[PDB]
Design a binder for this molecule. Structure first.
Ligand SMILES: CCCCCCCCCCCCCCCCCC(=O)OC[C@H](COP(=O)(O)O)OC(=O)CCCCCCCCCCCCCCCCC
Ligand SMILES: CCCCCCCCCCCCCCCCCC(=O)OC[C@H](COP(=O)(O)O)OC(=O)CCCCCCCCCCCCCCCCC
Ligand SMILES: *[C@@H]1O[C@H](CO)[C@@H](O[C@@H]2O[C@H](CO)[C@@H](O)[C@H](O)[C@H]2NC(C)=O)[C@H](O)[C@H]1NC(C)=O
Ligand SMILES: *[C@@H]1O[C@H](CO)[C@@H](O[C@@H]2O[C@H](CO)[C@@H](O)[C@H](O)[C@H]2NC(C)=O)[C@H](O)[C@H]1NC(C)=O
Ligand SMILES: NC(=[NH2+])NCCC[C@H](N)C(=O)O
Lengths: 458, 149, 100, 124
């Protein structure tokens, strides 16, 4: 991989289903067009300053996983255990639930033209996408990657149609929605903070950039150069798509809209308006099919330290797929969509993710006072992880002191419930602990035909 | 004027505001069946019904002078006392009248909410006086409207 | 100033579109009100308009006398209750909600 | 004997038994059938749901004579700017549609409206 083809993996991973779902709730919190475009630019700065901090840790430590070896080197085994627990039950199944709910908003919306589709059709079509993707990825290890090339191709076709059609209509003089852009706004730290949650969901994927892009012709120069080029190129596409929405829509019509891209495609492309619910739905299950490939990489290394059940990250003998980890992610994702509601799963995902984004970036500053003699090839200026830590404190504390809703309580009570399991199964190796786990490991092994992966660390 | 009627609880503006709020928040009023009864020199009585929703609205409007009404002789299966949902005299909101004798002043209108499963458009004696546009039934377990009646 | 069978023709045919509804002013033409006279206006519209069409109702307008001067002040509240409990679209002339 | 972490060859002497072959097989075909039930129940509800109401069927209409509604520039005549300043009153009446009568540039403002220019507003 060169430099130019290193940009292609960064852009193709970050651009997903977020730009088709998030513009309604960024505008709903900052109720003007002017501050709505400031937020979509400021999340592009947080995503590039966050990915530069992860690029330093990824060449410093050189152990696979996610944030798990970065948290173990800085604090010890307690926040490393809490990351593998909170990514097992909170972070990874809610990501799979938001995407499959985003697929169902776009399949159902052209059949309800001036109307709102009922929640039972949105949820029972999103549940059929979770079960179908979990069945395909648990049987056909090579089939998920062949169709991924035509899902990436359908994704950046509909992105280029929206960006170009917005520049043509803006040239003809359709600029009357940007006239008094800063009248009617919120300087509230609960409304600004929730516009950052939904804006940073569309930028999600900047922290998984470390591992699959170490295969470059000259790392330690081409990796930090792929972040300064790759993610501000995504920020240029996200601002241009939101400008393209406000040329055909008022800020009031965008709030009263089920799917924001089927409303755009009804005013611009009339005799072929069905290509927007067709390509966005292909782009969305391509984003859900991609996450089931790496299911088990963090599970395996956390099980090696004894911080995770080892019956997960077993491999089926026929159809060499990580079938226990894929089936477990599908069960928690169908449980999350029954209370459901995108704008409640986005706040639930973003509170847990940015609690641990700010712990590894603070761990970068801890490892400069505690962990010298450590051979840093990439080295950031020290003010970049300082402000990225303080912004992560703002994204955690401000929702619970301004607009405390009930999903922020279930997210705390599920993370700290893992803190009890640390003191009963890791810290105090009780005798009745492995009297339970290996009976479950042995019987699930014969039920699914799954073996230990014929694989050591590397 | 508008300003003095915003601060009067028995004004014409207040009755207009919660009649249009009730019309916006009730599927029986904006979408339901319309089933009128027999003619009368004094009053007009009709119902608003919808299949799957197991309550009805009973509208009683006196257009003559002061009269007394026996609603038992017009609708079968009513209780001995009915609660008023809305009245042209808004002091009578939530009050209970007795079904056998309902006293109506000149120009008095009442809306009753009655829990029942006896819809008039299903009976063959009232089907010729029942009307709909955009016919649908309501599913209370799924919270949807459906057309397969 | 038209017959009900000619007014209903503006609804069109099931295979030919026309007006969404013709405006119904038959309640505005009642100079005195009664139980039999309100009944015959309501049943004339519902029986004559085609099946599955949308009705509408008016009680006044710019060419009609205002309702508290046409019928009296005792009928303001009950004519508003009639307008919002009948099927279809209620149409309100300005000032009727106050009783001008 | 199965212990906890069996290889490929110890597992095959026990995974083919009847107490592990039929609970694996019915749990696979109840998931594939649940994909086809949740898909057919989606096409059942979409094809059976009624076409919902247009905006002109949903809420009440409010008819305004524009010369008599609200005067904003102190000339004794109601204007279109005076209607814009009273839109909070109209939304508090739970009104869906505003019906404005004729405001075209006219020589005759009664008797069914003799209009001079169908594409201009009258200056009053
Ligand atoms: C209400 C809140 C709680 C809800 C909980 C719901 C739980 C529902 C579980 C449903 C499981 C569905 C599994 C089928 C998924 C098929 C996906 C697929 O394509 O498979 C390919 C895969 C390919 O196999 P092949 O066809 O043999 O090649 O098929 C299977 O492996 C099917 C095996 C079924 C696996 C069932 C696993 C169930 C684990 C339950 C263990 C519970 C232990 C608890 C002990 C507690 C002790 C305290
Ligand atoms: C195929 C999908 C299912 C397979 C995976 C689940 C297996 C079924 C058993 C479920 C758990 C049964 C009780 C725990 C048994 C192990 C206890 C123990 O002693 O650990 C030793 C264990 C080591 O065991 P070893 O792997 O044998 O060495 O120590 C730990 O791993 C500590 C970490 C425990 C992590 C617990 C994970 C629990 C997953 C289920 C969470 C349920 C809530 C989901 C979210 C709420 C709904 C939204
Ligand atoms: C109608 O006008 C009267 C008098 O102009 C207002 O009544 C009171 O006026 C005195 C001044 O003489 C004020 O001190 C009082 O506060 C007024 N009363 C109230 C209740 O405001 C009255 O406000 C006007 N408006 C109405 C009746 O809606
Ligand atoms: C209800 O309507 C019927 C029929 O329209 C009325 O019955 C007769 O109607 C004719 C002409 O419409 C009159 O000449 C008769 O005098 C009416 N008969 C009686 C006994 O009144 C009937 O009056 C109406 N009103 C009711 C039943 O209250
Ligand atoms: N690991 C993941 N796939 N996370 C979700 C990525 C979401 C993606 N950035 C989007 O625009 O929707």
């Amino acid at each position: 991989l060169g430099l130019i083809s290193g940009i292609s993996i960064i852009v193709g991973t970050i651009i997903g289903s977020g730009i088709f779902v998030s513009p309604k709730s960024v505008l709903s919190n900052t109720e003007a067009v002017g501050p709505c475009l400031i937020i979509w630019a400021a999340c592009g700065v947080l995503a590039t300053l966050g990915a530069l901090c992860f690029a330093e840790l990824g060449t410093m430590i050189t152990k696979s996983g996610g944030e798990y070896p970065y948290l173990m080197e800085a604090y010890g085994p307690i926040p490393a255990y809490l990351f593998s627990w909170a990514s097992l039950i909170v972070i990874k199944p809610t990501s799979f639930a938001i995407i499959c709910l985003s697929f169902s908003e776009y399949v159902c919306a052209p059949f309800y033209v001036g109307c709102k589709p009922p929640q039972i059709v949105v949820k029972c079509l999103a549940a059929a996408a979770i079960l179908f993707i979990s069945t395909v990825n648990s049987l056909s290890v090579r089939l998920g990657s062949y169709v991924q090339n035509i899902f990436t191709a359908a994704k950046l076709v509909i992105v280029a149609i929206i960006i170009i059609s917005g520049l043509v209509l803006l040239a003809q003089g359709n600029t009357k929605n940007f006239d008094n852009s800063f009248e009617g706004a919120q300087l509230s730290v609960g409304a600004i903070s929730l516009a950052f949650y939904n804006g940073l969901w569309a930028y999600d994927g900047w922290n998984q950039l470390n591992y699959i892009t170490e295969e470059l012709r000259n790392p330690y120069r081409n990796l930090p150069l792929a972040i300064i080029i790759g993610i501000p190129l995504v920020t240029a596409c996200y601002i241009l798509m939101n400008v393209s929405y406000f040329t055909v829509m008022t800020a009031t019509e965008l709030l009263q809209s089920q799917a924001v891209a089927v409303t755009f495609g009804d005013r611009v492309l009339y005799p072929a308006s069905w290509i927007v619910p067709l390509f966005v739905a292909f782009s969305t299950i391509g984003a859900a099919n991609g996450t089931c490939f790496t299911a088990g990489r963090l599970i395996y290394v956390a099980g090696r330290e004894g911080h995770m059940l080892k019956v997960l990250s077993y491999i089926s003998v026929r159809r060499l797929t990580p079938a226990p980890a894929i089936i477990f992610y599908g069960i928690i994702a169908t449980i999350y969509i029954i209370p459901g509601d995108i704008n409640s799963l986005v706040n639930y995902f973003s509170f847990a993710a940015w609690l641990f984004y700010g712990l590894t970036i603070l761990g970068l500053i801890v490892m400069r006072f505690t962990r010298k003699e450590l051979e840093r090839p990439i080295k950031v200026p020290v003010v970049i992880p300082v402000l990225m830590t303080l912004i992560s404190v703002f994204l955690v504390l401000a929702p619970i002191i301004s607009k405390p809703t009930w999903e922020y309580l279930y997210c705390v009570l599920f993370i700290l419930s893992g803190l009890l399991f640390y003191f009963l199964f890791v810290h105090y190796k009780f005798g009745w602990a492995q009297k339970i786990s290996k009976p479950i490991t042995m019987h699930l092994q014969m039920l699914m035909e799954v073996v230990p992966p014929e694989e050591d660390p590397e | 004027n508008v300003d003095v009627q915003k601060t009067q609880p028995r004004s014409a503006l207040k009755l207009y505001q919660d009649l249009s709020l009730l019309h916006a928040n009730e599927l029986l009023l904006n979408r339901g069946w319309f089933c009128h009864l027999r003619n009368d020199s004094h009053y007009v009585v009709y119902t608003r019904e919808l299949d799957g929703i197991d309550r009805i609205f009973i509208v009683v409007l006196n257009f003559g002078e002061s009269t007394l009404l026996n609603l038992h002789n017009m609708i079968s299966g009513l209780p001995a006392k009915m609660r008023i949902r809305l009245s042209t005299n808004s002091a009578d909101k939530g009050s209970k009248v007795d079904t056998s004798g309902i006293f109506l002043d000149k120009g008095e209108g009442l809306i009753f909410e009655h829990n029942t499963k006896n819809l008039l458009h299903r009976q063959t004696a009232f089907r010729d006086r029942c009307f709909v546009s955009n016919r649908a039934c309501y599913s209370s377990v799924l919270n949807i409207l459906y057309t397969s009646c | 100033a038209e017959s009900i069978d000619r007014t209903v023709m503006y609804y069109g045919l099931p295979f030919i579109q026309e007006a969404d509804f013709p405006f119904n002013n038959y309640l505005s033409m009642l100079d005195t009100v009664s139980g039999n006279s309100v009944y015959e206006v309501i049943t004339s519209w519902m029986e004559n308009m085609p099946e599955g069409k949308w009705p509408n109702w008016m009680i006044g307008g710019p060419d009609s006398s205002r309702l508290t001067s046409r019928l009296g002040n005792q009928y303001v509240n009950v004519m508003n209750m009639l307008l919002f409990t009948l099927p279809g679209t209620p149409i309100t002339y300005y000032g009727e909600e106050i009783g001008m | 004997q199965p212990y906890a972490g069996m290889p490929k060859e110890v597992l095959f002497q026990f995974s083919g038994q009847a107490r592990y072959r039929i609970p694996r097989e019915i749990l696979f075909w109840l998931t594939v059938a649940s994909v086809l039930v949740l898909i057919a129940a989606t096409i059942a509800i979409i094809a059976l749901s009624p076409k919902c109401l247009d905006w002109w069927q949903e809420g009440p209409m409010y008819q305004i004579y524009p010369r008599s509604f609200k005067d904003s520039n102190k000339d004794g005549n109601g204007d279109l700017k005076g209607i814009q300043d009273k839109l909070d009153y109209i939304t508090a009446l739970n009104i869906k549609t505003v019906w404005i009568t004729s405001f075209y540039k006219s020589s005759l403002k009664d008797f069914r409206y003799g209009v001079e220019d169908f594409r201009e507003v009258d200056p009053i």
